[PDB]
Symmetry: D4
Subunit: 185 residues, 8 copies
């Protein structure tokens, strides 16, 4: 089953994490972790602050490489360098409504590409991505070259967007405390 | 072949079984068992009464866990706890006309989901389902939490309905003796 | 796991079956069936009389081909013609003490041969055999030619004996009521 | 590759074979055998007369079971009983224009069914079929019951037709010497 | 790789845990968890007290079934019921020196058995075991029957001991504070 | 991943190579090699002149068979005779804009055929092809017979074109120095 | 099964074939072909004279490459160039007593080498060999270089001899009419 | 075949390379590269000077990470970070006589360990090693911690030595110009 073959990754982030804010009594990041854990056996968190908080929920924390690369691609590479799986499903800490069929639909729509990401009908979410570790070398070269754009990298690896337009508000991103209030129960 | 990789399961049921009523001289439940056995090598019955009757046809009987959980989800969990296969095709005892391509079409339409169930064009039949044992833990947690709704559980596991609208009256359910007479040869 | 990939077969037999005699309150044949069922998910009985008795324990009964071939090889061929698996573990109905690691040790010692059988340290037991269905054609030709010897056939298929000399009295065969009394609890 | 996993079978037939008539200087049956051999490594002929003629082209001949069953289903069963492969692509001896992508398109369109056959846009060709050996038991039971209809059997096994409407006159069947003249170069 | 296919399990235990005592500044249980994590990607803890302590190291905690079964077999069953993997490597919390090749050597010596455990040259360590989930049903039946002996169960499943006599004091068990002092740096 | 299972091949060619002309400071052939190397681990060059130039970029050079067959099919056969992989993705040296998802889309669209090639919306590019080595024998026979047409061969093997009409000018072929100037940065 | 994964090859030979002489009423070469066919589904003959005789038994004949290379290695290469399988079991036409477990024992003793050959206790039989097609390129280079020694080539490919010293006179080679008389029934 | 699944790596080295000295007219490093290339399809060189020389032979050059880690472990990690394969066979540039069965014997003797290295009968050669990429994370952590010993790392990963004592002088290391003269033809 996909459950035992794809490693889930919460991209908790940067260099308080807004992901710590509670939505309906549960921290945003935990909404993501719990959705991943329902679909996937082994799930880890990429975090570079508050490591103890993430770890305390029972999740292994992976810190960024000491190369000090920028942005979400840095976390993806760090996780591929420190985890042995073939496949990783990454998701940022602030998209709490990710759907229960995230991994399956991304997997089914890979069409043999080494990377796919979500398009929600209105926009791309390139950091909600199913990624094969075979692009580790390409990613390392990209970041070493000083590049940082996520979707450009994923296209250059041969990736494509996968349509989730039928999954109503599943990809809402909670940018701020104010947006969070529009969603509170 | 699918024949040797999916375990068939007749959900015979609850806590006389109407499934014992004869349709064209063969008990309703045996119509289901025979359809499954044409498609699948290893087929078992989940039953908690009349065990000897089901067993006498040459089928292994699996009784519900002693946890005493409610409804069809209880039978599904009990069967996953007592049978070693990866995949199970469950079907209630009162849908005698299930088609010869049930397993194949559900399998082909999984789209990497761990569970799929039949939609006949007019309604869902969530207990006619192809289920991967990877959702055993989720199911146990669900039932332990006191929940019982079948389709809600299957959606929460990442499942989806599969269209059988082209299979004419294959999913008729014989609810009563009277409906049975509308179908007798 | 081997449990879900090898079909167990009780060779109950010929053309009352002594296998119906009780050992410690359980019929000899059921001792074999239960040992197989502990190791293997799907287990069937090759029987040509008392079919209802074997079937009543929850086991599918396979009757001999109508070709009317002689001996245990006839049952093996009939089972391969009527069951879809790749691998079969056959055992006669009168060796009640067969060990819990029968399938694993035969499987592990195959050394890529399509058939292996037990040698108990003193003699061969050619009908206690792990057999790949690829020898179905060879077997059919053999029986069609009028041949019946079991071990000769298994050698001609490229098979070999596997040493069980360390499994103390596990291969005792209960030939008669008198031998049975030497074993009764 | 499919080339090494599916056994090709020319259904040469019955109980002179018109299949011996030359089309453009090559016997009809050899047109079929050559098309199969371009796509498949191992190809055999089911024949019950002129065995030496078929054999002389370098092809193994498989004769019908001695059960004496009727029609093309008899040949299919005989071939599954005498050949070890999992998959068989059968084709009658009088459809000389079968296409170079026959195996691939049937395989790709299986949708997990154990059997598929060609529909040419106007009619079914149920004996041009890709068949998994798992239906051997079902077939044996069917023929033993006295049944003979091909498409009924293939539906009962869970099979379906595959559309070849885009393959222009590839499924012309040469019924007679006169039809053959409409096709001669 | 084995690293991504076997789930590691620390059997932390019963119904303060001595496993919390520090050896060379690291709690005994963490010595086991760290050895497992060097060999295996996904590692969990079976604990029924101090859950927060185990969880805080980044490990998922699995609590015993509510069936309330006795002993280490209870933990094994609970973990198989709540985790989706095929294979589990269990180790008690008080054998801190387990070797770096534990999983590989147990895996390599399985000889197709569904369960193997360590023999250190002087005694069996039946709870240091590599176990296939196919024995889940057998285990459930065993515990339901009121049985508790570990090695008896593992033999009945078809398991065997694997020789680690060459791994010098790797299987020392720290029974008490006093034995711990014989080992402190 | 596809990256490690398909061998990339630059068809550099014939019996100066225009492929040596620089586009935006990089030789045309290197544009192809670099695009292949982003998608595929192991990439080689079929060249029969300037071998040292191609080799100096770190690529293994494969020279044509001494059979002296004509055209691109000759190079394909030579590469299959001298390289051990199952799958090869061939591309001529003068299509510098080949897309990053070339291998994946051809692979995904194989529909079980042993060979597929690109159709760009306006024309076929039969030498931009994903080819299974199983057609090596067919190819050898074809060339031995004196035949040379590429697309005819690929159809006779059971191949088909795959639509790349959505990949804007990715298949521009630089025929001459003048066309090259229409493309220079 | 090995039966469907290894192609058998009778090395009938050179540039009447003594292999045509009858042993116990069956031509020597047919003794080899029949032994191979008992173990392997698909078996072919490498012959460069009397092609019609070999073909008439139902076997496909493969003729040597037109490169005109010398000796048995030439036949091996020709067969790998004209047959799609991964594995080939070659045997010369004059070793009529080859054993029924030839393929299995060579396969089991490969120890991951791409080629193995028989040692009968007194001498090597390098042309009785199980060969992976991955050494096709190496073989082509070897023969192109003008080399011909068989065992030297097989060692250079990483091969080794496999002990058949326990298979009594199974590897007798019938060199002449006189030796043949020492063996006639 | 192993040929297409293990990436060969020449550890050319440090921070003229003695590996450039000619043995029998071929540079020492090329003796290693050629031995690897006979056994493995895809072979690369880890070099940090004279990159152009290594590249000119047709081999891809991989330079060390910019982390600037010390010794051969640094090269191994750099290659795993920049190459997508699962398995790597590393060999230093100065052991020109490495045997033709290096990969097979190391592979066969893995006994499920993620790393194995050569013992020649007198000493370990820890840099002649077959390594699974699953130990990439462990290696990164090891080097980050400031550790450098090779064999200690390989043991900590669960590795073991494999006996090559029967391969006469195959592991001679050419330390100097003087030792080289003891070996010159
Ligand atoms: N590992 C790592 N992750 C980062 C870094 N910077 C950002 N991220 C991750 O990248 C994703 C986007 O990060 P941010 O831009 O901080 O957060 P944001 O407000 O969600 O950004 P948008 O919603 O896309 O405007 C999140 O999952 C953050 O955890 C970084 O330097 N290292
Ligand atoms: N194992 C188990 N199965 C149950 C239980 N209750 C119901 N089922 C199974 O769930 C399915 C629906 O059960 P019922 O509601 O008894 O029967 P029904 O009249 O077919 O229900 P509907 O047609 O859906 O109105 C059937 O297959 C019954 O066998 C239970 O407590 N345990
Ligand atoms: N299917 C089938 N099985 C047979 C037939 N004859 C014998 N057997 C099976 O072959 C095995 C040996 O059969 P028997 O010779 O009847 O019984 P037995 O007294 O156990 O024979 P031995 O202990 O070997 O002297 C048993 O498993 C019987 O079930 C037959 O005609 N058909
Ligand atoms: N093995 C076997 N094959 C048969 C038998 N009868 C027919 N066939 C095969 O079934 C297919 C149809 O057979 P026929 O009805 O003889 O020939 P036909 O004139 O092609 O029939 P149609 O074109 O379908 O009208 C052919 O491939 C014949 O070889 C039989 O008794 N045994
Ligand atoms: N899940 C669970 N585990 C238990 C239970 N009882 C014991 N264990 C586990 O079984 C193993 C042996 O447990 P104990 O007898 O408490 O500890 P011990 O002093 O290590 O026992 P010995 O060293 O074998 O004398 C340990 O890993 C404890 O965690 C239980 O009731 N449930
Ligand atoms: N190996 C080999 N390759 C050849 C041979 N002839 C042509 N090719 C390859 O086939 C492809 C087409 O070759 P050409 O016709 O020389 O070049 P072209 O101008 O690109 O041809 P078009 O653009 O198709 O008009 C290229 O990749 C050339 O490298 C040959 O004799 N041997
Ligand atoms: N394809 C091919 N096979 C050859 C050629 N020469 C010999 N062989 C094969 O190589 C094997 C040995 O061939 P020979 O030396 O003719 O026959 P032999 O008398 O069996 O040789 P020994 O018994 O080894 O002394 C046989 O299987 C012959 O078929 C050749 O030129 N081409
Ligand atoms: N990538 C990398 N490789 C190194 C480094 N240092 C040494 N090596 C590799 O490690 C192996 C041993 O290196 P050296 O100690 O330079 O050479 P040596 O004289 O062969 O060493 P010994 O024979 O073991 O005494 C060789 O393959 C050198 O290429 C390094 O800093 N980086
Ligand atoms: Mn955000
Ligand atoms: Mn109902
Ligand atoms: Mn007996
Ligand atoms: Mn017809
Ligand atoms: Mn203890
Ligand atoms: Mn061109
Ligand atoms: Mn000879
Ligand atoms: Mn050195
Ligand atoms: Zn985990
Ligand atoms: Zn069954
Ligand atoms: Zn064949
Ligand atoms: Zn390469």
């Amino acid at each position: 089953n996909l459950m035992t073959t794809i490693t889930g990754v919460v991209l908790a982030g940067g260099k308080v994490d807004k992901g710590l804010l509670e939505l309906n009594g549960k921290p945003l990041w935990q909404h993501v972790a719990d959705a991943l854990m329902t679909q996937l056996s082994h799930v880890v968190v990429n975090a570079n602050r508050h490591q103890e908080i993430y770890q305390a929920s029972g999740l292994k924390v992976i810190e960024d490489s000491l190369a000090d690369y920028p942005g979400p691609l840095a976390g993806m590479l760090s996780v591929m360098q420190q985890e042995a799986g073939e496949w990783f499903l990454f998701c940022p800490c602030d998209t709490p409504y990710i759907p229960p069929d995230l991994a399956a639909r991304l997997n089914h729509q890979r069409k043999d590409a080494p990377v796919v990401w979500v398009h929600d009908g209105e926009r791309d979410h390139p950091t909600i991505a199913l990624v094969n570790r075979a692009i580790e070398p390409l990613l390392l070269e990209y970041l070493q070259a000083g590049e940082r754009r996520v979707m450009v990298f994923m296209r250059l690896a041969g990736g494509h967007a996968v349509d989730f337009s039928d999954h109503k508000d599943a990809f809402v991103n909670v940018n701020t405390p104010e947006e969070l209030a529009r969603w509170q129960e």
